[PDB]
Amino acid sequence: LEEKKVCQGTSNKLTQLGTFEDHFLSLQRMFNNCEVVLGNLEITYVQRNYDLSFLKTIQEVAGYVLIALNTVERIPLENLQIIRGNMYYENSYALAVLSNYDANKTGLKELPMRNLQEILHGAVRFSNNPALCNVESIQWRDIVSSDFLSNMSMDFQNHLGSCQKCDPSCPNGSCWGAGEENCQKLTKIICAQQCSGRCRGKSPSDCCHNQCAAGCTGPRESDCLVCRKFRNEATCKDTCPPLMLYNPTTYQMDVNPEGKYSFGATCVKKCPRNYVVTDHGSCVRACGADSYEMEEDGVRKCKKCEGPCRKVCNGIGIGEFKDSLSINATNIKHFKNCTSISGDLHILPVAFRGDSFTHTPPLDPQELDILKTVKEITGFLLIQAWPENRTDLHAFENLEIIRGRTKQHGQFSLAVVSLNITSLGLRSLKEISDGDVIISGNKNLCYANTINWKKLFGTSGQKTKIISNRGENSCKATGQVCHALCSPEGCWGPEPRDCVSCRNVSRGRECVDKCNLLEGEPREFVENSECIQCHPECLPQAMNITCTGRGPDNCIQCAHYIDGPHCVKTCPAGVMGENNTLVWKYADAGHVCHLCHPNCTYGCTGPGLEGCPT
Amino acid sequence: LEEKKVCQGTSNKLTQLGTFEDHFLSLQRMFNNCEVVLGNLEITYVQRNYDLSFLKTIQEVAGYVLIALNTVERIPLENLQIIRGNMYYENSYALAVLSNYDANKTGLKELPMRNLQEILHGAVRFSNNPALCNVESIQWRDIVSSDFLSNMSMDFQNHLGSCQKCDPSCPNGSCWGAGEENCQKLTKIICAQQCSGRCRGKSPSDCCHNQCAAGCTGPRESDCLVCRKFRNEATCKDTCPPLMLYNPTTYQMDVNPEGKYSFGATCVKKCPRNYVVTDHGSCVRACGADSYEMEEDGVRKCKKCEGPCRKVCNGIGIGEFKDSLSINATNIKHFKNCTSISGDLHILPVAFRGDSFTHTPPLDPQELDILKTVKEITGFLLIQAWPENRTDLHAFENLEIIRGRTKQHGQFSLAVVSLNITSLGLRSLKEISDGDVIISGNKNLCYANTINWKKLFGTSGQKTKIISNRGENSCKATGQVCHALCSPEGCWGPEPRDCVSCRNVSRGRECVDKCNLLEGEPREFVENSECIQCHPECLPQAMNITCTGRGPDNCIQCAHYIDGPHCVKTCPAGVMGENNTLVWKYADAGHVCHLCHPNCTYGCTGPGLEGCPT
Amino acid sequence: ECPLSHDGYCLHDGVCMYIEALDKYACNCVVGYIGERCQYRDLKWWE
Amino acid sequence: ECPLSHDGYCLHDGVCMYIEALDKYACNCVVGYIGERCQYRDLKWWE
């Protein structure tokens, strides 16, 4: 069976996004054809005559549901079955319908949520809707759980008389509107004494499974309308089946033939490639407090550490930086020496001009070098501002991985927008494990559409969005192309140390035209297209090559003396040996090193005793 | 019934334990006052006019039930509710009634198992019971699981026919004999399509939980008659509640306030003190080969092996050693470098004489020194034979722990019966973590009573059964009472090296009366009731104390060079200190060598800077 | 509209508003910027 | 009774016997020894 289409949902509570039609276009552009909102559902500032019929598809919301400040007459949320309530509005509410009138005290009228049957966690708040019809009759006992029946705030005041009665066919007049299709379907309070949860009837043969959230169409666990905690292949589980089962007979643990990894609210066959795999059989985002993320054995793992594990910082939006929205000038200290951000990174224009609202001073551009030790982000990277004097993302030169576990808007994992930089300069970036890439709006940066991003993309379905940066020929005319010392693979900047691969060879972190063979100041050799210096004790060969390796063992001829296989500067004269006996040697004719006479303690300048006048 | 009285259950398939009245007593001593047979239930060779009325208390057999070769009329297994079938008879059957007739064709007539409603695994077999009647009428489709409904082998013949038909209030005429309660109680095949497991009535409001095994008195998991897999102190669970719970919203693991450790078929709050604890929270007996057990914080965990982790050899009766029953000469080789036996140890008289029926050559007595490297046994140690020329248990000399995870008869973890040995000789045994001790029947064994076995035990409730050895008055009558140079704590032999503790002081392993502080051998110093020699550089004196500690910081006489805060035979001649040069130390008249300038780095055998020449 | 403590509340040149119906403060974001304080660019639509 | 293929099957002086009904071979242990072939001493009764 096919997945349900998901949408991210908004998180801007009462904020208006432009005019009344700029706002409605964003609401429409987001929740069109959606069927499962992963975040919140916020319907605000919708004016009359607007057609909200694209909301007829949403079936469950994982956050809250806020309906405020509207003036439209009817909001057709008539397929919503569940509000999971994983996030509250005003700390207590998983459904708030507030102040839906215009100046004339005539606003929202028809909210026919005729399929809304359960609100997992949270209360409900209704207030100040002077034209709302047929909702004060609802019995909210069947919907919201009994733990929260005390935190509810229902204020109903129409008392104008623009409503019609409820079709006399449902218990106690409880109706969601007018019609034989539009009244409350009770599934919890009409249960028999033995039904553990929801029940599709009053007879004791109608109890649903203990994991059906809204209701059911059968007694089993594959007959739920919507699962309550976890979701197996087609059944509703309480917990994902463990990978290993205990054997009460042999007092050991046996492999489970259908053990699944718990990932999010589903049981999968195997964790996603970029997620950490614990031993409980669960895909997580960060190893435990006493564990550090162990290397890839094909997959990520958590290994226990001895004493201090390491220095790893929490990114923005997690841990102590839960409500900070940028890299303040006050929190920047806490990223002092950590080489792996365990979260996100936002750099917004607020950091650089300060924020008086949260009492934050302006950030100092020279302090951004604190991030030069970072080598791995496990979330995303969002750079919206950079100091204008700088012409490169200098703080992120040592960055190598972006894991992309949490993405921006749920899609992007690297975003560089509206900056003054001339080149990106992430010269050591190697991989982007998940999420898209947007680099657009930078009026000068053009060293950006040369990289082969498909090399960095760890998975499939990743794309790059690089538009309206600079010219693509206006900096190829002024010469802002890469150095001819770079492979056609790509280039991060104008230097030769800013290429993906080299044309000929390389001197460490920089590309060159040829190794220093034959001539040059330091003698070198070639292996894997790298230039390594010969041991200082290798004689500068003006004819052929000089050496065939790093060690003095590969020299063509030595510079001073020769102690056997090795090329030494001066023959040993005090080196520890066997039986605690010292070692003294001498240089003969061919500058060869030979051992002294055992007796010669103060060393010797010749063979045997005649050689050392002691 | 806060706890059900358990018994171990026999394992004698068709063996007869002596005369017909000696067999009946073993059956009567094993199963008297039992309610849960932890093993098998075998009722064989029960003759006519014998009282089997002690069987009416059994409620659950965890293995198989074998009823064969009896000639008694009525076997009253009325309370038997379930046969878990953890072990089959003939690889197939969890219940077997076979050939219950004597020569006169008379025999079994009444088998009133009215409460037998479930057989979790295995089939049923009936054969050659030419007097058993009112049992072919049962419908075994309700009892035996549908997976094994094909292996069943049921053939009945009652040519005699001396009994009556089934009471009218019997379902389809199916009765367990004459009577109204003797009718069969159907709980699986009569019920509606809602009930997945068992049930109580034909109505779909009568389905039992899927964890109840026989039946139920309610719809909750807390209303089962017997549990199907596990038992959380009041409720039948599928698996024990985990210790950590996944969180689909933060993608991290959280502590479970109601997490239990699984220990057999029960979920407990903490593992026994001598069991291993895994990270799943499960009490195991010996964890996987990829890991190795280790003590930590009072409990016994096990960490991952690093390359070559030590050898842990299997025990008799587990793994590749299930066929075997002793250390027969075939498998003695597999125990070479073992420092722990994960399992048991059975040394039986059939090892030293060789078994034809299994083709094992007679073991060579000297071949037992291989066991002188074993240092602990996680199961038990059972010794029934030992070479006749020996005096003590020499092969088990470095044994230190007997954890007693699995025991013998479920009771004894150290059993040394009917040996010609003179002294025990286990002069390393420090703990017997569980199980009783029996050291009885040894024809001439002294010293076995001087040990207070309370000090060795680790759990309260462990007895000892040291009975009928060499007489305690006939031990001292020939001087066979251990040395007076030892504390009144015990002794495993006549030598001073066999005492548990001493009266004055110990010297490495042997206990002496003083650490020769004044005369004789190289004098030492006392610490922690030992004798420890100070390094022989410490010049000895024959007048009073000669040293205080190991190092030279506290000696009194130092004939060697007293190089300041220490002593040494010869002061250093270039030891690696600072300045990256051979740190020299010239010769002194007061044995206190000092350092000279870097100029004389040859031997600087003179004091001062200008005073070292060549 | 909104008091002195809420100057610089709306980022990216948004304008702060007072909602007398609910007694709250909200931002009127410019086109292209989302979030409660107009802090985020709308990367999913038009750069 | 039982053939020479079963010599020494019963340990501790037990006598091997044939069960013509079930067509199998079993032991008759002496008093004090238990097990399928009389291999174990009965510890919890009479030492």
Short mmCIF file of C-alpha atoms in Angstrom, two decimals, chain A residues 86 193-196 200 204-205 210 219-220 229-230 239 242 244-253 262-266 275 278-280 282-288 304 573-574 582 584 601-603 613-614, chain B residues 86 193-196 200 204-206 219-220 229-230 238-239 242 244-253 262-265 275 278-280 282-288 304 573 582 601-605 613-614:
data_model
loop_
_atom_site.label_atom_id
_atom_site.label_comp_id
_atom_site.label_asym_id
_atom_site.label_seq_id
_atom_site.Cartn_x
_atom_site.Cartn_y
_atom_site.Cartn_z
CA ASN A 86 3.10 16.66 19.89
CA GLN A 193 -17.38 -1.75 30.69
CA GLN A 194 -14.87 -4.19 29.18
CA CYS A 195 -13.70 -2.25 26.11
CA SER A 196 -10.16 -1.10 26.86
CA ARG A 200 -17.48 1.18 17.37
CA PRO A 204 -19.45 -5.80 24.14
CA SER A 205 -18.45 -7.42 20.83
CA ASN A 210 -5.82 -1.20 22.23
CA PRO A 219 -11.37 -6.20 16.30
CA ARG A 220 -7.82 -6.82 15.09
CA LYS A 229 2.11 4.90 18.88
CA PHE A 230 3.94 2.94 16.16
CA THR A 239 6.72 -1.06 20.21
CA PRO A 242 12.87 -6.37 19.05
CA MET A 244 16.63 -10.32 19.55
CA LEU A 245 14.18 -12.27 21.69
CA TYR A 246 14.85 -13.68 25.14
CA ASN A 247 14.63 -17.45 25.52
CA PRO A 248 13.10 -18.27 28.93
CA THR A 249 14.23 -21.90 28.58
CA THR A 250 17.92 -21.60 27.68
CA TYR A 251 18.40 -18.25 29.48
CA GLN A 252 19.87 -16.71 26.32
CA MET A 253 18.81 -14.40 23.50
CA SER A 262 12.35 1.66 15.15
CA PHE A 263 12.78 4.82 13.08
CA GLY A 264 10.58 7.76 13.96
CA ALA A 265 7.03 6.45 14.33
CA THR A 266 7.55 3.49 11.99
CA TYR A 275 21.36 7.79 11.00
CA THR A 278 21.98 1.73 18.54
CA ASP A 279 21.88 -1.83 19.87
CA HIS A 280 18.26 -1.67 21.03
CA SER A 282 16.49 2.00 17.08
CA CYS A 283 17.71 4.72 14.72
CA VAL A 284 18.74 7.79 16.70
CA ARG A 285 20.34 11.16 15.98
CA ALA A 286 23.05 11.39 18.65
CA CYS A 287 24.88 8.83 20.77
CA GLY A 288 24.29 8.74 24.51
CA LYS A 304 31.24 3.50 25.00
CA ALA A 573 78.16 7.58 19.33
CA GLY A 574 76.10 6.76 22.41
CA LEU A 582 76.74 1.53 24.55
CA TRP A 584 80.35 3.76 19.17
CA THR A 601 84.47 3.40 25.99
CA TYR A 602 85.24 7.02 25.06
CA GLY A 603 84.54 6.02 21.47
CA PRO A 613 94.15 6.33 22.48
CA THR A 614 92.47 5.77 25.89
CA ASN B 86 9.65 -27.55 26.26
CA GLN B 193 -14.35 -15.08 14.51
CA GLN B 194 -13.48 -12.16 16.81
CA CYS B 195 -11.65 -14.32 19.35
CA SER B 196 -8.12 -14.95 18.12
CA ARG B 200 -15.29 -18.91 27.30
CA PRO B 204 -18.15 -12.82 20.67
CA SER B 205 -18.10 -10.95 23.99
CA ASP B 206 -16.20 -13.90 25.51
CA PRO B 219 -10.94 -10.00 28.98
CA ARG B 220 -7.82 -8.46 30.56
CA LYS B 229 5.14 -16.72 27.60
CA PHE B 230 5.99 -14.40 30.52
CA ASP B 238 4.50 -11.29 25.53
CA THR B 239 7.89 -9.80 26.42
CA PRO B 242 11.95 -2.80 28.25
CA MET B 244 14.57 2.08 27.76
CA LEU B 245 11.75 3.33 25.55
CA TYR B 246 12.07 4.89 22.11
CA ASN B 247 10.70 8.38 21.48
CA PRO B 248 9.32 8.91 17.95
CA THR B 249 9.36 12.69 18.47
CA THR B 250 12.95 13.29 19.60
CA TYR B 251 14.44 10.15 17.99
CA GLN B 252 16.13 9.22 21.28
CA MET B 253 15.78 6.57 23.97
CA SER B 262 13.68 -10.85 32.21
CA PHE B 263 14.83 -13.90 34.19
CA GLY B 264 13.41 -17.11 32.80
CA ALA B 265 9.64 -16.88 32.42
CA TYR B 275 23.89 -13.91 36.98
CA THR B 278 22.88 -7.62 29.47
CA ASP B 279 22.07 -4.18 28.11
CA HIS B 280 18.63 -5.40 27.05
CA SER B 282 17.94 -9.77 30.74
CA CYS B 283 19.50 -12.17 33.23
CA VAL B 284 21.64 -14.54 31.15
CA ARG B 285 23.90 -17.44 32.10
CA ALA B 286 26.87 -16.72 29.81
CA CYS B 287 26.87 -14.03 27.16
CA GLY B 288 27.96 -14.38 23.54
CA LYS B 304 32.97 -6.59 23.72
CA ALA B 573 75.81 6.67 33.81
CA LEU B 582 73.17 11.26 28.68
CA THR B 601 80.27 13.20 28.77
CA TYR B 602 82.83 10.37 28.39
CA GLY B 603 82.91 8.98 31.91
CA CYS B 604 83.51 12.10 34.04
CA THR B 605 85.07 9.86 36.67
CA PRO B 613 89.95 14.68 32.53
CA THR B 614 91.16 12.14 29.88
#
